């Protein structure tokens, strides 16, 4: 019973890979020979945000590209003003082992979560004048690794119990649950239209979900080690992902196949954070060899290096207007980088 | 600029208040030691933490010894996939690794040895010290004197093993019992001393999971860790 079922699942996989081979006739590198290289990308540290005690593990820009929240493992959720370096908020967390930040697109709420398996939603408008825990979403049995607001009333979270979940802050209940991964789910990225989202897991596979109905659409398997970071391309038709095998990869949803691999022979460290530039031409990747580096998404050659951190780069984020790049690190420092 | 001077002044005052509170929080934070309690469900870890005290993915215990605060964390509702959430504990003072000295379902001592090898050689835990608790010593005492055990067979090199000269047996203890104890301790120290390089240290202890001295063992080992860190900052070690 099980033997024949496995022997037919494997030929389903063979048919899938045959279709993938049929799709792939021209490589993205070959079609991008006609374009010119972006040249060396020189980026300079404009700001350095100090104030966190322990390592910064997550971070998130606001929609106004000015305010940003960051989480530290000492139990602090700090909201900064990147323009003036002033600290706007210093929320203290009930649980010190936070592993994720979200900032509501409206700007009224901030989310956090971690090893306590709880997604805490904090109101920032403070009708009484103080920031308070607006909600505490419970139901995950792993650990919170990522969380992103769909809107003021909805949030999608990634857990170490091998599951993603879309919630409803008003009622505090799991509106829907996304299952199908095998290992820990380490990151999630929302599509620009907020109709789909991708998740990378510890089974070395990325997975695309439709939010409103709640089941897997496509599975991408090109990496050989667990995926640490994932991010959508600006137009929503592709996404990049980094793993511990020291490679970034680009996947196209419509082609449903890996397009390009960003790797170097002298990099043997994992990739912790991934982000795209405003136009998608630059792919910035944070590494745990203490520095970030900037690839170009079309030529697969390094275009720059962001070397200012004394410990591994944990988090990385580009603003909505593409003006600055924030990098966080285990040295407890946050750095803003801009072009010259 | 008349409408923006006031808001900038308000931001500066808010930042000053935040900085004062953060200075207080830093003073509180630097005065406490964070410990990661690690082990198996069949060890005495739960009994040890229950004695120390006298759904959630993390469990917390605050205990004070000699006016020094200790903040011990226990793993709760988590899977057996420790790859990713172990890295959260690279800045703790110590990992208290509890191992049941009894090798039944299978060779659980071998599984604990493999787990200790993984913890020791992890690139993010390579500066974190491990306090080793060779727990359940009474089971060793009343298992090797019962006539037959599963230690001489599951570890073929135990037959050609002699008690170390620097061993300090408890008075009125059979030489077989202390031979087995120090054989397991040396099994852990073989992989502890193979890659130490002076970055971090191991502190083996023979514990019984019910006694008032485990908290003092943790206190003394933490003191040793802090002193060695200070001496390393001065390049005296």
């Amino acid at each position: 019973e099980l033997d024949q079922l496995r022997q037919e699942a494997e030929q389903l996989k063979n048919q899938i890979r045959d279709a993938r081979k049929a799709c792939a006739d021209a490589t993205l590198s070959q079609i991008t020979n006609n374009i010119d290289p972006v040249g060396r990308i020189q980026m300079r540290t404009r700001r350095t945000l100090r104030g966190h005690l322990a390592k910064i593990y997550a971070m998130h820009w606001g929609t106004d590209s000015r305010l940003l929240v960051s989480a530290s493992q000492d139990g602090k959720l700090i909201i900064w003003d990147s323009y003036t370096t002033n600290k706007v908020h210093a929320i203290p967390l009930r649980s010190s082992w936070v592993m994720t930040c979200a900032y509501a697109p409206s700007g009224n709420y901030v989310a956090c979560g971690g090893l306590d398996n709880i997604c805490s939603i904090y109101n920032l408008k403070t009708r009484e004048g103080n920031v308070r825990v607006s909600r505490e979403l419970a139901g995950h049995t792993g650990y919170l690794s990522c969380c992103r607001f769909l809107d003021d009333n909805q949030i999608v979270t990634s857990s170490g119990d091998t599951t993603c979940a879309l919630w409803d802050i008003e009622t505090g209940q799991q509106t829907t649950t996304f299952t199908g991964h095998t290992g820990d789910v380490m990151s999630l990225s929302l599509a620009p239209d907020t109709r789909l989202f991708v998740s990378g897991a510890c089974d070395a596979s990325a997975k695309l979900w439709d939010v409103r109905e709640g089941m897997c659409r496509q599975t991408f398997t090109g990496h050989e080690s667990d995926i640490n970071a994932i991010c959508f391309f600006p137009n929503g038709n592709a996404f990049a992902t980094g793993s511990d095998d020291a490679t970034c990869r680009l996947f196209d949803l419509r082609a449903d196949q890996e397009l390009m691999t960003y790797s170097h022979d002298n990099i043997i460290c994992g990739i912790t954070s991934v982000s795209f530039s405003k136009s998608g031409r630059l792919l910035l990747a944070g590494y745990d060899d203490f520095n970030c580096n900037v690839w170009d998404a079309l030529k697969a050659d390094r275009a720059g290096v962001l070397a200012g951190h004394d410990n591994r780069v944990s988090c990385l984020g580009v603003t909505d207007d593409g003006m600055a790049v924030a990098t966080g690190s285990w040295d407890s420092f946050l750095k803003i980088w801009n072009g010259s | 600029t008349e409408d923006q001077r006031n808001e900038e002044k308000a931001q500066r005052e808010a930042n000053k208040k935040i900085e004062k509170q953060l200075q207080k929080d830093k003073q509180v934070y630097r005065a406490t030691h964070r410990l990661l309690l690690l082990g198996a469900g069949e060890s005495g870890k739960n009994t040890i933490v229950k004695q120390m005290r006298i759904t959630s993915g993390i469990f917390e215990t605050k205990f004070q010894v000699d006016k020094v605060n200790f903040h011990m964390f226990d793993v709760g509702a988590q899977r057996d996939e420790r790859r990713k959430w172990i890295q959260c504990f690279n800045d703790v003072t110590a990992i208290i690794f509890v191992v049941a000295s009894s090798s039944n379902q299978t060779n659980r001592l071998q599984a604990a040895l493999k787990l200790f090898d993984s913890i020791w050689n992890n690139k993010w835990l390579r500066d974190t010290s491990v306090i080793l608790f060779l727990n359940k010593q009474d089971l060793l005492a009343e298992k090797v004197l019962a006539g037959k055990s599963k230690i001489e067979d599951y570890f073929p090199e135990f037959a050609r093993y002699t008690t170390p000269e620097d061993a300090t047996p408890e008075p009125g203890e059979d030489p077989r019992v202390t031979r087995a104890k120090y054989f397991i301790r040396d099994e852990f120290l073989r992989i502890s001393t193979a890659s130490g390089d002076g970055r971090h240290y191991c502190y083996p202890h023979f514990t019984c999971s019910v006694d008032t001295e485990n908290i003092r063992r943790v206190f003394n080992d933490c003191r040793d860790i802090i002193q060695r860190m200070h001496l390393r900052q001065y390049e005296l070690l």
Partner: nanobody
Amino acid sequence: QVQLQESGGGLVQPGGSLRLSCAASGFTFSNYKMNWVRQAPGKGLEWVSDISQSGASISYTGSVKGRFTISRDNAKNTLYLQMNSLKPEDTAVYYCARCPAPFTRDCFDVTSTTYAYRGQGTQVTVSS
């Protein structure tokens, strides 16, 4: 796609020799350390032996060392387990398991319930 296929196994008389082979694809064989684990009937997963990137460093569980041997072929991308002089307590499903990450020495997770980089396994039975 990372996958490990185990071949061999079967039923053999006690004291006999039986060979297990492990064919790997979807990753670079050389820069990963690998190992053999097993699950006895009614028991949990236990670690049998491991071999490093280059095959220079080898270790075995105590109840096995002296009997089984392991070797890796990076040219053929294949792991081996020689099981001469078998014993009745060696009946189990054997899994060829891979290290989570390359260029590492700790290599945490192998004998988990739902480990991903692990093969389907082959049943090895000894009886008379």
